[PDB]
Short mmCIF file of C-alpha atoms and ligand atoms in Angstrom, two decimals:
data_model
loop_
_atom_site.label_atom_id
_atom_site.label_comp_id
_atom_site.label_asym_id
_atom_site.label_seq_id
_atom_site.Cartn_x
_atom_site.Cartn_y
_atom_site.Cartn_z
CA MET A 1 0.00 0.00 0.00
CA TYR A 2 1.16 3.55 -0.76
CA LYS A 3 0.03 6.71 1.07
CA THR A 4 1.01 10.29 0.05
CA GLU A 5 0.95 13.03 2.69
CA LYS A 6 1.46 16.71 1.90
CA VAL A 7 3.52 18.77 4.33
CA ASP A 8 2.96 22.46 3.63
CA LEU A 9 4.24 24.92 6.22
CA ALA A 10 2.75 27.88 4.33
CA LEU A 11 -0.57 26.66 5.78
CA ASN A 12 -0.72 29.34 8.49
CA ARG A 13 0.93 32.34 6.77
CA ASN A 14 -1.45 35.11 5.70
CA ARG A 15 -0.92 35.21 1.91
CA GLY A 16 2.52 36.09 0.49
CA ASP A 17 3.50 36.88 4.08
CA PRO A 18 7.02 36.93 5.51
CA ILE A 19 8.15 33.31 5.86
CA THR A 20 8.51 32.10 9.44
CA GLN A 21 9.38 28.44 8.92
CA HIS A 22 12.09 27.00 6.65
CA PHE A 23 12.96 23.34 6.06
CA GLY A 24 16.24 22.49 7.70
CA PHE A 25 17.94 22.67 11.05
CA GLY A 26 18.62 25.65 13.27
CA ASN A 27 21.71 26.21 15.40
CA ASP A 28 19.96 25.88 18.76
CA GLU A 29 20.24 22.53 20.55
CA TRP A 30 17.95 19.78 19.24
CA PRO A 31 17.89 15.95 19.76
CA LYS A 32 20.49 14.59 17.22
CA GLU A 33 18.61 11.25 17.06
CA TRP A 34 16.71 13.24 14.47
CA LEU A 35 19.51 12.81 11.91
CA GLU A 36 18.81 9.06 11.87
CA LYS A 37 15.63 9.76 9.92
CA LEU A 38 16.36 13.19 8.41
CA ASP A 39 18.90 14.53 5.89
CA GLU A 40 20.50 17.98 6.22
CA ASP A 41 17.67 19.70 4.36
CA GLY A 42 15.19 18.57 7.02
CA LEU A 43 13.64 16.08 4.63
CA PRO A 44 13.75 12.32 5.30
CA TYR A 45 16.31 10.12 3.55
CA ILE A 46 14.61 7.94 0.92
CA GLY A 47 14.23 4.31 2.02
CA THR A 48 14.07 5.02 5.74
CA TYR A 49 11.95 2.84 7.99
CA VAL A 50 9.54 5.04 9.92
CA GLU A 51 7.20 4.05 12.73
CA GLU A 52 4.72 6.05 14.85
CA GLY A 53 6.33 9.06 16.49
CA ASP A 54 9.41 9.26 14.27
CA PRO A 55 10.41 12.50 12.56
CA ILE A 56 9.41 12.86 8.92
CA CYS A 57 10.26 16.51 8.70
CA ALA A 58 12.34 19.20 10.38
CA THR B 1 31.38 64.55 -10.33
CA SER B 2 32.74 62.30 -7.59
CA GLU B 3 34.64 65.30 -6.21
CA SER B 4 31.93 67.95 -5.95
CA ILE B 5 29.51 65.33 -4.62
CA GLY B 6 32.16 64.69 -1.98
CA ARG B 7 32.55 68.37 -1.13
CA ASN B 8 28.78 68.44 -0.65
CA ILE B 9 29.12 65.50 1.75
CA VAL B 10 31.74 67.46 3.69
CA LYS B 11 29.60 70.60 3.53
CA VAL B 12 26.97 68.70 5.50
CA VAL B 13 29.19 68.30 8.61
CA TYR B 14 31.05 71.58 8.40
CA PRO B 15 30.25 73.59 11.56
CA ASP B 16 29.38 77.04 10.18
CA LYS B 17 26.70 78.52 7.97
CA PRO B 18 26.67 79.27 5.01
CA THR B 19 27.87 75.78 3.95
CA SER B 20 24.67 74.25 5.27
CA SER B 21 22.64 76.81 3.31
CA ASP B 22 24.80 75.34 0.55
CA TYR B 23 23.13 71.96 1.08
CA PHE B 24 19.90 73.97 0.83
CA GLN B 25 20.78 75.06 -2.71
CA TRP B 26 21.46 71.49 -3.95
CA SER B 27 19.33 69.50 -6.39
CA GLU B 28 17.24 66.32 -6.49
CA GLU B 29 20.08 64.25 -7.89
CA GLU B 30 22.48 65.56 -5.24
CA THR B 31 19.95 64.60 -2.55
CA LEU B 32 19.48 61.22 -4.23
CA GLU B 33 23.17 60.32 -4.43
CA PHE B 34 23.20 61.60 -0.86
CA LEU B 35 20.66 59.06 0.41
CA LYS B 36 22.70 56.55 -1.58
CA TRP B 37 25.85 57.43 0.36
CA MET B 38 23.69 57.35 3.49
CA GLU B 39 22.57 53.74 2.99
CA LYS B 40 26.11 52.76 1.94
CA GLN B 41 28.38 54.52 4.45
CA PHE B 42 25.94 54.91 7.34
CA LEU B 43 25.93 51.19 7.69
CA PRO B 44 29.10 52.41 9.41
CA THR B 45 26.65 53.51 12.10
CA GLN B 46 27.26 53.41 15.86
CA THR B 47 25.42 51.50 18.61
CA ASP B 48 9.47 39.26 20.09
CA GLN B 49 9.74 42.91 19.07
CA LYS B 50 13.01 42.35 17.20
CA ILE B 51 11.64 39.74 14.79
CA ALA B 52 8.49 41.87 14.89
CA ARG B 53 10.67 44.56 13.31
CA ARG B 54 12.25 42.12 10.85
CA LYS B 55 8.75 41.33 9.59
CA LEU B 56 7.74 44.94 10.33
CA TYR B 57 10.47 46.34 8.09
CA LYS B 58 10.03 43.39 5.70
CA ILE B 59 6.51 44.83 5.22
CA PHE B 60 7.95 47.42 2.82
CA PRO B 61 10.61 46.34 0.33
CA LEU B 62 14.25 46.99 1.18
CA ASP B 63 15.21 46.53 -2.51
CA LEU C 1 24.07 16.78 -5.36
CA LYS C 2 20.93 16.13 -3.29
CA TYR C 3 18.18 17.09 -5.80
CA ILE C 4 16.98 16.49 -9.35
CA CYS C 5 14.96 18.69 -11.65
CA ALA C 6 11.54 17.17 -12.41
CA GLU C 7 11.44 18.65 -15.91
CA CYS C 8 14.95 18.60 -17.44
CA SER C 9 16.53 16.05 -15.08
CA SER C 10 19.65 18.09 -14.37
CA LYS C 11 21.22 16.98 -11.09
CA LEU C 12 21.80 19.93 -8.77
CA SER C 13 22.21 21.08 -5.17
CA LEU C 14 20.85 23.88 -2.97
CA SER C 15 22.08 26.04 -0.11
CA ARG C 16 20.80 28.25 2.72
CA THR C 17 18.15 30.56 1.22
CA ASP C 18 18.71 29.58 -2.40
CA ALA C 19 16.53 29.65 -5.51
CA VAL C 20 14.14 26.69 -5.05
CA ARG C 21 14.20 26.06 -8.82
CA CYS C 22 16.27 24.42 -11.54
CA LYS C 23 19.33 26.49 -12.42
CA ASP C 24 18.87 25.38 -16.05
CA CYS C 25 15.07 25.24 -16.60
CA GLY C 26 13.66 27.61 -14.03
CA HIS C 27 11.17 24.91 -13.18
CA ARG C 28 10.21 25.19 -9.56
CA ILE C 29 9.71 21.53 -8.78
CA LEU C 30 12.59 19.36 -7.50
CA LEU C 31 12.92 15.65 -6.64
CA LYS C 32 15.14 14.58 -3.74
CA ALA C 33 18.08 12.21 -4.33
CA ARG C 34 19.53 9.81 -1.88
CA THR C 35 22.85 8.81 -0.44
CA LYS C 36 25.03 5.94 0.80
CA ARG C 37 23.49 4.98 4.14
CA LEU C 38 22.85 1.86 6.23
CA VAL C 39 19.36 0.36 6.23
CA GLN C 40 19.10 -3.14 7.68
CA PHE C 41 16.65 -5.86 6.66
CA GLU C 42 15.75 -9.40 7.58
CA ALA C 43 15.40 -11.62 4.50
CA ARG C 44 11.89 -12.80 5.33
CA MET D 1 16.91 75.42 9.45
CA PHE D 2 14.16 72.85 9.93
CA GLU D 3 13.22 70.64 12.89
CA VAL D 4 15.39 67.54 13.21
CA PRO D 5 13.84 64.06 13.69
CA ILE D 6 16.38 62.97 16.30
CA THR D 7 16.63 63.04 20.07
CA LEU D 8 18.66 66.13 20.92
CA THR D 9 22.35 65.70 21.81
CA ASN D 10 22.35 65.78 25.53
CA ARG D 11 24.46 66.81 28.58
CA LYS D 12 24.58 70.62 28.52
CA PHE D 13 20.93 71.00 27.50
CA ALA D 14 19.83 68.82 30.42
CA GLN D 15 21.97 70.52 33.07
CA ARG D 16 20.72 73.85 31.73
CA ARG D 17 17.18 72.54 32.15
CA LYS D 18 18.25 71.81 35.75
CA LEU D 19 19.50 75.32 36.47
CA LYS D 20 16.42 76.80 34.79
CA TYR D 21 13.68 74.86 36.54
CA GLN D 22 15.55 74.94 39.87
CA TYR D 23 15.80 78.74 39.86
CA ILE D 24 12.19 78.79 38.62
CA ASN D 25 11.24 76.81 41.71
CA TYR D 26 13.03 79.17 44.09
CA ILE D 27 11.48 82.32 42.59
CA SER D 28 7.93 80.97 42.38
CA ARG D 29 8.23 79.47 45.87
CA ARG D 30 9.21 82.78 47.43
CA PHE D 31 6.47 84.42 45.34
CA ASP D 32 3.77 82.23 46.92
CA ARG D 33 5.47 82.89 50.26
CA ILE D 34 4.90 86.61 49.69
CA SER D 35 1.31 86.07 48.56
CA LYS D 36 0.70 84.18 51.82
CA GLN D 37 17.27 64.78 42.18
CA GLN D 38 15.75 63.65 38.89
CA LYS D 39 12.54 63.53 40.94
CA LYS D 40 12.76 67.15 42.13
CA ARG D 41 13.13 68.13 38.49
CA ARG D 42 10.22 65.76 37.79
CA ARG D 43 7.65 67.23 40.18
CA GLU D 44 8.96 70.68 39.20
CA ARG D 45 8.44 70.27 35.45
CA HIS D 46 5.34 68.27 36.38
CA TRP D 47 2.73 70.50 37.97
CA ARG D 48 1.95 72.35 34.70
CA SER D 49 -0.31 71.64 31.70
CA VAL D 50 2.01 69.25 29.95
CA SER D 51 -19.79 76.16 7.71
CA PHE D 52 -16.89 73.68 7.83
CA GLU D 53 -15.82 71.02 10.29
CA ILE D 54 -13.85 73.09 12.80
CA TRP D 55 -12.99 71.13 15.96
CA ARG D 56 -13.73 74.37 17.83
CA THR D 57 -11.79 75.57 20.89
CA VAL D 58 -13.04 76.85 24.28
CA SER D 59 -13.93 80.53 23.89
CA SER D 60 -14.09 83.33 26.49
CA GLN D 61 -16.83 83.12 29.11
CA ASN D 62 -16.81 82.04 32.76
CA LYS D 63 -13.33 83.45 33.48
CA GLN D 64 -11.89 85.71 36.20
CA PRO D 65 -12.14 89.46 36.85
CA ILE D 66 -8.56 90.84 36.53
CA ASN D 67 -5.54 91.64 38.73
CA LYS D 68 -3.89 94.96 39.50
CA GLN D 69 -0.18 95.44 39.55
CA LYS D 70 1.74 92.97 41.67
CA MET D 71 5.30 93.84 40.80
CA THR D 72 7.16 97.09 41.31
CA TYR D 73 10.93 97.29 40.93
CA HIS D 74 11.58 97.15 44.68
CA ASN D 75 9.08 94.33 45.27
CA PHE D 76 10.36 92.20 42.40
CA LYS D 77 14.01 92.55 43.40
CA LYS D 78 12.72 91.59 46.85
CA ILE D 79 11.51 88.28 45.41
CA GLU D 80 14.58 87.89 43.21
CA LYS D 81 17.39 88.77 45.62
CA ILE D 82 17.66 85.51 47.57
CA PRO D 83 16.93 82.68 45.06
CA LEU D 84 19.72 84.04 42.87
CA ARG D 85 22.39 83.19 45.47
CA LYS D 86 20.96 79.76 46.20
CA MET D 87 21.60 79.50 42.46
CA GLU D 88 25.10 80.79 43.16
CA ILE D 89 25.79 77.43 44.85
CA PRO D 90 25.24 74.87 42.02
CA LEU D 91 26.25 77.36 39.33
CA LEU D 92 29.69 76.67 40.77
CA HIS D 93 29.28 73.01 39.75
CA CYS D 94 28.01 73.55 36.20
CA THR D 95 30.11 74.63 33.24
CA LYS D 96 31.10 78.20 32.43
CA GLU D 97 28.96 78.36 29.30
CA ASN D 98 26.07 76.84 31.25
CA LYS D 99 26.62 79.41 34.00
CA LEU D 100 26.56 82.17 31.38
CA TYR D 101 23.29 80.77 30.04
CA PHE D 102 21.87 80.82 33.57
CA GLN D 103 23.01 84.43 33.97
CA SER D 104 21.44 85.53 30.69
CA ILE D 105 18.11 83.73 30.89
CA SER D 106 17.87 85.04 34.46
CA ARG D 107 18.50 88.56 33.23
CA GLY D 108 15.73 87.79 30.76
CA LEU D 109 17.86 87.74 27.61
CA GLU D 110 17.12 84.93 25.15
CA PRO D 111 19.99 82.84 23.80
CA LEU D 112 21.22 83.39 20.24
CA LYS D 113 21.94 79.76 19.40
CA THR D 114 19.48 76.87 19.07
CA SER D 115 20.06 73.43 20.51
CA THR D 116 20.55 72.23 16.94
CA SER D 117 22.84 75.17 16.13
CA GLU D 118 25.27 74.09 18.85
CA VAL D 119 24.73 70.24 18.65
CA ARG D 120 27.95 68.24 17.61
CA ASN D 121 27.48 62.97 15.04
CA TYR D 122 28.13 61.26 11.70
CA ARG D 123 25.37 58.64 11.76
CA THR D 124 22.73 60.96 13.20
CA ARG D 125 23.50 63.78 10.74
CA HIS D 126 23.22 61.25 7.93
CA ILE D 127 19.88 60.02 9.27
CA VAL D 128 18.84 63.69 9.44
CA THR D 129 19.57 64.08 5.73
CA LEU D 130 17.85 60.76 4.95
CA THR D 131 14.63 61.62 6.79
CA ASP D 132 14.73 65.13 5.33
CA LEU D 133 14.90 63.76 1.79
CA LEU D 134 11.99 61.50 2.70
CA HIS D 135 9.79 64.40 3.77
CA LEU D 136 10.91 66.51 0.81
CA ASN D 137 10.23 63.82 -1.77
CA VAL D 138 6.83 63.03 -0.24
CA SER D 139 6.04 66.72 -0.56
CA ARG D 140 7.28 66.61 -4.16
CA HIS D 141 4.93 63.78 -5.21
CA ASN D 142 8.11 61.79 -5.94
CA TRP D 143 6.53 58.64 -4.52
CA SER D 144 9.16 56.42 -6.16
CA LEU D 145 12.20 58.15 -4.66
CA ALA D 146 10.36 58.83 -1.41
CA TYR D 147 9.65 55.10 -1.24
CA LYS D 148 13.35 54.34 -1.64
CA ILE D 149 14.06 56.86 1.14
CA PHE D 150 11.47 55.24 3.42
CA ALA D 151 12.75 51.68 2.92
CA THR D 152 16.39 52.67 3.43
CA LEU D 153 15.36 54.65 6.52
CA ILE D 154 13.28 51.99 8.31
CA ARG D 155 16.25 49.71 7.62
CA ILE D 156 18.35 51.72 10.05
CA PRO D 157 18.61 50.87 13.75
CA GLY D 158 18.97 54.54 14.65
CA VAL D 159 16.05 56.47 16.18
CA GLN D 160 12.41 55.65 16.59
CA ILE D 161 10.41 58.62 15.28
CA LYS D 162 7.04 60.00 16.35
CA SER D 163 7.37 61.43 12.88
CA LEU D 164 4.37 59.15 12.46
CA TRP D 165 1.96 61.63 10.80
CA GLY D 166 4.82 62.20 8.38
CA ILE D 167 4.61 58.53 7.44
CA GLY D 168 0.80 58.36 7.64
CA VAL D 169 0.32 61.06 5.04
CA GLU D 170 3.58 59.81 3.49
CA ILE D 171 2.64 56.22 2.66
CA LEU D 172 -0.88 57.59 2.10
CA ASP D 173 0.13 59.79 -0.82
CA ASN D 174 2.81 57.26 -1.76
CA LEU D 175 0.52 54.39 -2.85
CA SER D 176 3.77 52.84 -4.06
CA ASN D 177 4.52 49.64 -2.17
CA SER D 178 4.89 49.30 1.48
CA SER D 179 2.31 47.97 3.98
CA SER D 180 0.30 51.08 4.04
CA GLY D 181 -0.82 53.96 6.27
CA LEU D 182 -3.56 51.84 7.79
CA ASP D 183 -1.03 49.09 8.57
CA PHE D 184 1.26 51.68 10.14
CA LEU D 185 -1.54 53.23 12.20
CA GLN D 186 -2.94 49.96 13.57
CA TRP D 187 0.69 49.06 14.29
CA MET D 188 1.05 52.29 16.30
CA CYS D 189 -2.02 51.40 18.32
CA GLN D 190 -1.05 47.76 18.82
CA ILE D 191 2.47 48.54 20.04
CA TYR D 192 1.65 51.70 22.01
CA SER D 193 -1.58 50.86 23.85
CA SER D 194 0.02 48.97 26.73
CA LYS D 195 2.62 49.44 29.45
CA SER D 196 4.65 46.86 27.54
CA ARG D 197 8.06 64.78 28.87
CA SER D 198 10.05 66.57 26.16
CA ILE D 199 9.22 65.32 22.69
CA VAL D 200 5.47 64.90 22.93
CA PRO D 201 2.75 67.42 22.07
CA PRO D 202 -0.67 66.03 20.83
CA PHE D 203 -0.05 65.11 17.18
CA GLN D 204 1.90 62.07 18.42
CA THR D 205 0.62 60.55 21.58
CA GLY D 206 0.22 57.61 23.95
CA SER D 207 -2.77 55.29 24.28
CA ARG D 208 -3.76 56.03 27.88
CA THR D 209 -5.95 58.97 26.83
CA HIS D 210 -6.54 60.18 23.39
CA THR D 211 -4.16 59.32 20.68
CA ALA D 212 -5.84 61.74 18.31
CA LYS D 213 -4.65 62.78 14.84
CA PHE D 214 -3.68 59.53 13.12
CA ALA D 215 -6.54 57.45 14.57
CA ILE D 216 -9.40 59.77 13.71
CA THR D 217 -7.88 60.44 10.29
CA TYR D 218 -7.63 56.77 9.31
CA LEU D 219 -11.19 56.44 10.66
CA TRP D 220 -12.74 59.19 8.55
CA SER D 221 -10.45 58.55 5.58
CA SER D 222 -11.50 54.89 5.62
CA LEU D 223 -15.17 55.89 5.58
CA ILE D 224 -14.13 57.90 2.50
CA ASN D 225 -12.57 54.71 1.14
CA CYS D 226 -16.23 53.70 1.32
CA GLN D 227 -17.12 56.88 -0.55
CA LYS D 228 -15.12 54.83 -3.06
CA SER D 229 -17.88 52.23 -2.67
CA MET D 230 -21.17 54.11 -2.93
CA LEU D 231 -15.22 47.78 3.87
CA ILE D 232 -17.38 49.64 6.43
CA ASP D 233 -18.10 46.77 8.82
CA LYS D 234 -14.34 46.20 8.54
CA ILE D 235 -13.41 49.78 9.50
CA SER D 236 -15.95 49.81 12.35
CA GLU D 237 -14.96 46.21 13.10
CA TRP D 238 -11.49 47.46 14.07
CA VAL D 239 -12.98 50.67 15.45
CA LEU D 240 -15.11 48.16 17.37
CA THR D 241 -11.96 46.25 18.34
CA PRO D 242 -9.95 48.77 20.38
CA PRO D 243 -10.75 49.93 23.89
CA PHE D 244 -9.54 53.55 24.27
CA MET D 245 -12.82 54.85 25.59
CA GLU D 246 -12.15 58.59 25.45
CA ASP D 247 -13.14 58.99 21.76
CA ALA D 248 -16.83 59.58 20.88
CA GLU D 249 -15.41 60.44 17.48
CA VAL D 250 -15.50 56.70 16.84
CA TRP D 251 -19.08 56.80 18.07
CA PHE D 252 -19.85 59.25 15.27
CA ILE D 253 -17.78 57.02 12.98
CA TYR D 254 -19.93 54.10 14.13
CA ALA D 255 -23.24 55.92 13.65
CA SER D 256 -21.91 57.08 10.27
CA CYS D 257 -21.30 53.44 9.35
CA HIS D 258 -24.95 52.78 10.23
CA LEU D 259 -26.19 55.76 8.22
CA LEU D 260 -24.08 54.63 5.26
CA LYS D 261 -25.39 51.07 5.61
CA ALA D 262 -28.92 52.51 5.87
CA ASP D 263 -28.12 54.34 2.59
CA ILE D 264 -36.22 45.95 4.94
CA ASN D 265 -36.69 45.62 8.70
CA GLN D 266 -32.92 45.06 8.63
CA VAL D 267 -32.50 48.63 7.36
CA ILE D 268 -34.89 49.54 10.18
CA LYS D 269 -32.51 47.99 12.71
CA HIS D 270 -29.64 49.97 11.16
CA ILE D 271 -31.61 53.22 11.52
CA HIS D 272 -32.50 52.49 15.15
CA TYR D 273 -28.80 51.63 15.51
CA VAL D 274 -27.53 55.01 14.30
CA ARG D 275 -30.23 56.64 16.43
CA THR D 276 -28.63 54.91 19.42
CA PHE D 277 -24.97 55.67 18.74
CA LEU D 278 -25.66 59.37 18.11
CA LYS D 279 -26.72 59.68 21.76
CA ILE D 280 -24.03 57.38 23.14
CA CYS D 281 -21.97 59.85 21.17
CA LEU D 282 -23.62 62.64 23.09
CA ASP D 283 -21.67 60.69 25.72
CA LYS D 284 -18.57 62.81 25.12
CA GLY D 285 -17.20 66.13 23.79
CA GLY D 286 -19.77 66.64 21.16
CA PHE D 287 -19.51 66.23 17.42
CA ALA D 288 -22.75 67.91 16.37
CA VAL D 289 -24.59 68.51 13.19
CA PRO D 290 -27.82 70.27 14.24
CA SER D 291 -28.54 66.51 14.26
CA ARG D 292 -32.19 67.15 13.61
CA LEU D 293 -30.55 67.19 10.18
CA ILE D 294 -29.15 63.72 10.88
CA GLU D 295 -32.67 62.74 11.92
CA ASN D 296 -34.08 64.42 8.79
CA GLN D 297 -31.95 62.15 6.64
CA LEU D 298 -33.29 59.38 8.87
CA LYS D 299 -36.87 60.42 7.97
CA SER D 300 -36.01 60.59 4.28
CA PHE D 301 -35.08 57.01 5.19
CA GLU D 302 -38.31 56.47 7.15
CA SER D 303 -40.00 56.96 3.77
ZN1 ZN E 401 15.55 22.01 -15.11
#
């Protein structure tokens, strides 16, 4: 079975607004286990096994 | 020319009148190249709401 | 070279605040591409 | 030779304000006697008032019945003689130019040189020229240039400006780009309506009691952006939004929104509505048509 989900973080922004949220990682301190699922862009590496609760996006 | 435009820029911070009346008698292009030199060389400036002013200023284009 | 153009197929990479578009086409739709990494499976 | 949109370069002007209001205190104190600290400066400067649509003034009636001479030469120099020496004490601490200023203003002479004329900084003088060119271009209908000036200006860290009516009418006549006069005004009210002096007369103000010019002008001018129509329930939706109760002018804005929406029992409710807000606009410092004229339009409606 295949399921396609759309992640769209322009969902809140009020039309051509300044952009608050950008795919990727910041320089604050965040888990690091995250890089097991996610590439540098904040998108998940293709092929990755993913079960409930895992990151699919950063 | 680069020179006279410069001498205008010095005229602005010369202590005595008339030279400031001299900036009075300058012309739209002088004022324009002035604001240019202002945004260029008064980045050599001195000394929540902050991001609110990044979006606030990003309300009107910086170009 | 993490990404691929969906229209012209040119392989290309991005950076921090970069033109989310093909540097050849100008098409604004990019497919991710994927890199040597360990995934483990049981042959059953 | 024009007002500068910067906080005035400091020290000597402030210590002169000291000498001035301190001597003022000693003279007026002994004067009330004869009629019988940052904070000292603060109380001192404190107890003192700080056919067309004319927002009329308060004319002459219900006021006093004169005075007859209080101050001969001998009597004045009586009041003056002592507070001048008390002044002799801290005059010894201030600077020689400052002391001279104290001597001359206390003789009654008025100083030749402005605060600007004796001021003495690169970045601020450059911002002065920037802002100036903004105001000039906005006067010159040069909305393109003026827009460049505005963007480059707001970029800068250096000074906040009350200058706000400058930008209200500025972006107003600009039409060019940037999140416009209304956006600026509602920003002014959103930032400066919460706990969150020299510079301030009424045309730029704080939101404890009336912020006047910019608010009422976006109000009316937005109702004229409905004159574009024949938006209203928007304008009075965000005139509905704010609590800053000392207005009434937004009560007449409100009732004007109901007269404009009244141009079937719905229209009735709008006419009863304007009938209500005209009196809850008799609440405060009155904006009055003969208002039997308002009602006469409302009977042309009652048709
Ligand atoms: Zn392409």
